[model samples]
Target chain A: SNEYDEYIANHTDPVKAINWNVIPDEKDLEVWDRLTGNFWLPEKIPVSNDIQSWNKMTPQEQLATMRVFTGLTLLDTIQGTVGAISLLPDAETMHEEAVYTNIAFMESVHAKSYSNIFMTLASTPQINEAFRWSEENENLQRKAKIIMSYYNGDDPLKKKVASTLLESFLFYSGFYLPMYLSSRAKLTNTADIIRLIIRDESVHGYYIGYKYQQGVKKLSEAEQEEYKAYTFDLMYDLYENEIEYTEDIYDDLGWTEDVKRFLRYNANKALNNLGYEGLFPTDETKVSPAILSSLS
Target chain B: SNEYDEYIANHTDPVKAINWNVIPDEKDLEVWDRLTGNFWLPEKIPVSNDIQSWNKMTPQEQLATMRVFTGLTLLDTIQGTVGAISLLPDAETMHEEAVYTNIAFMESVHAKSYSNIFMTLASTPQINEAFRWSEENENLQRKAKIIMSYYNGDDPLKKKVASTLLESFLFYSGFYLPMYLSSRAKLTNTADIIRLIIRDESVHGYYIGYKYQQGVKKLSEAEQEEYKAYTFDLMYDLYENEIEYTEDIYDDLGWTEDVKRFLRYNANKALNNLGYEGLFPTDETKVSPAILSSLS
Candidate 1:
């Protein structure tokens, strides 16, 4: 068949109105309400308040912060345009698809939020270089490639796993810098915006992850067991690379070990979101009090 | 080729971060900023205020209003999921794709806004019946099928024509009821919420229409000439069915003639958005003064 004929044959047949009166899953309504209620923009926060704090940082610290944010930006960019859009095809309910729409737009907002921070805290040239650095960063590119591969795949459940991992797990290394600075009473406002983003990402993963489990339940037990192994294997591959990614960015500040623990803690949460057992020991996942205080 | 291979081969290669710093077209920044800057929710609109006004109307009036709103809801549902999504693959730049994400989420917001209305002014059974009526409406279904085919088609330019027409043209038939009531000083708050929706649709079609012209310009003059004919023919098809849709809903209330003029006015605007000449005579497109007043 021609591509048009194939698309015509395969496309969604007679799309129906999303009737909120009879929700297919109450969880969809639950998350949709939670999400819409928490809608926000970065402009609501006063990131400019952090400029004084930004100046106090050494050149090393400033550059590191910029690089980390651009890294997060890359992921949000993918999530907004590629990652979230990919999930729509697999959505079981029209309302569920609506949730993906909400997620995708906020991902755009999150992607734009970093630019909001950069324009206030750094020069145009500095901002340009940071984005360039993100482009060339080896580990970041690999992480993107790995996630994109799953997003581009035909397996719907695997797409959810990729999205949940990216949402709940992937950005922690970059997120830690803002939280750490907030813990130091610097960039607290920037941290404020990042916290909102973190909260939004959590819900995003929780919804997608729950949907993953919903789909997995219909499989035979052997297939379920196999998929669990697949989930773990994917997580392990990501963790190995995640550690190297953390080491590459955080090594200069000697925050690599601390960041690794943080990564483990969030990685465990990603697994939990996807309905898998946690992979790390409680002790192994323990992060710094300073980070904890900022997170709260 | 296998489906997976086709997808991998056709899927977006190595999706990149949307760097707002280097926008491909200044128009992108213009629309993106305008859209993000204008975000609102129905929850803020005090739709309950319209309830007292809603009670003053006849049962016929209330039922007609419900039916009309559900029709608009169906279109928003399609725009949120299918319409906005199908546009993504044809987007020429990352920033443009980002704008579609914004539009999609707001379309979800718009879809939910109608539900917010029903819960306020309608009984549960009434709401359910209205939705059922939407599903069974023959003309509404035809319009949806006509739009969906283009969205499902492989031709990018045709996809834009379908989207631009849907965004700009299709909803106007359903839009006239609230505007008419608001003009008479009833359901003004509902109209208030809808005006925001209307304003959003205008900017959406304007941007898509602008981009359609940009894409059309790159074709040979002969190809561009052929596309103008294609777009016009599609609009004419949509217009005839849209007239039927308007007549079915408005024939009972004696509003069909006035609604068709409003449809023609907006149809001309839709064509103008696509960089085509006006199809209606100046006098033929004159909408009712009351409708004009509420739109302002």
Candidate 2:
């Protein structure tokens, strides 16, 4: 009788048992399949062409490119290890856990991709310097710490929202810089790799944003409003950090304004993906044709 | 100048940068590729035939079946979550990390397969009871705790060695009991599922053992001996606990001796896989023809 009684109970606890036939969120399964279907190894992408392409860049262009990718490598390294480690164990269902794990795995690939690019395009000494440069970059450290604070906090809903912000906004902001370089600077080989990364991040950002939106729906109106305010505040702070970092990286290239506009476009896109009003106006006119084409 | 100096430095830290062209361990890459090739979904395995077959078993047989699977479900649940979480973060290379994460994902599938089997063959109440039974089972809890102690501890080398032995001995011990039942008792449907699980665990066990063997080679000769002695002690303790749990489940079914023999056979196999002397004497003659047939 105890056995039967126990069996009849705890059906609603998702972690206790996953009834795949009646999943709580069917979209999670779709995301899981999308991730699985898109699995790619870093070594398969040839960066040899990029190695020749890198030698042709102007001194200023090369410096800017290296700085941007170095910053991205740090963010991805954190996301691949800490972000996944923090969120995966807390996943409520097997499907959800699978999606998150795949996302984490992809982040590692993204991290490896950056290293692969460096290995292809730069000398071993130059690659090591980029890492050391990233370690000392004030703007990068500031950006990483702010997002990590939210990520490392206690509230599950807030943590999910923070992870989404990191994926959608912070990561996207840094990712697009390479895309911009690829088109405007004629760095097609580098752009090719960035395109592949962007494809992965697009799904990651959209999937996590959807999770954030779903998480918000369960909250009371007051809590939802509070969450929105927190998101806006965090985004603005991160946006400012992005601006400073972009300015520092692009100083020699004089592409600060272009980077700002690109950042705003992505910020608006991130908000829209989360089912929220865009925080910045979209300006197709201000964005470079290279950035737009690279994205397409 | 700083950039050049920095680039030239830190090439030795694999975490900072992975030279895919010069991998430290090519075998790790092979393991990772093998895991990727074997990716599967539990839903693909049709359990419709197993449903009717489950209903025809005697009370004693059915009870034994439920308890063994219940125990397995618990082991996999832990492996799927904490086990991967414990090791994946600390993995020294991207290839090793990939293999461990994939193994973790497969463990979650194994956990799901047990529930899938229940949903097809038994009532929701029966499923709940099985989980509740697992929660209260002393030997299962002990096995989980002992293995977890090694997993959750600080020493990475010891942890891998511990996990390797646990997978080889404890996990294989519980796994085979069901295979025995399916063969000797004609629990064909359950065997069908267990067969899939065994295939996965066999690889998982072997992979971890390979990792352990690799890890041990790094230790001082004295440390290696200490690790070997530690493993033997842990294996014997776990073997005794497995014998206890098997007797409890098979008390009425009269398969205690058969299960114990099976346990010793696998224990030796586990040791052999680890490249160690078997603590238990080998006996190919004692193994049932049915168990062998069920596996094939």
- The estimated TM-scores of all candidates read 0.94, 0.77
Expressed as tens digits, the lDDT of each residue in B141-165 for candidate 1 is 7777777778877889888888889
DockQ of each: 0.50, 0.15
Q: Model 2: how far is B162 from its true place, Å?
A: 4.2
TM-score of chain A of each: 0.95, 0.89
Question: What is the per-residue lDDT of model 1 for residues A77-121, given as tens digits with 9 covering 90 to 100?
Answer: 999888988999888888899999989999988998998898888
lDDT of 2 by residue, A175-233 (tens): 66677666655667667677777778888778777777887898999999988887787
Which pairs clash in model 1?
Answer: none
lDDT, residue A193, model 2: 73
Q: What is candidate 1's CA lDDT for residue B174?
A: 72
Indicate the worst ten consecutive residues by lDDT in candidate 2 chain A. Answer: A1-10
Clashing pairs counted in every model: 0, 6
Chain B TM-score of every predicted model: 0.94, 0.89
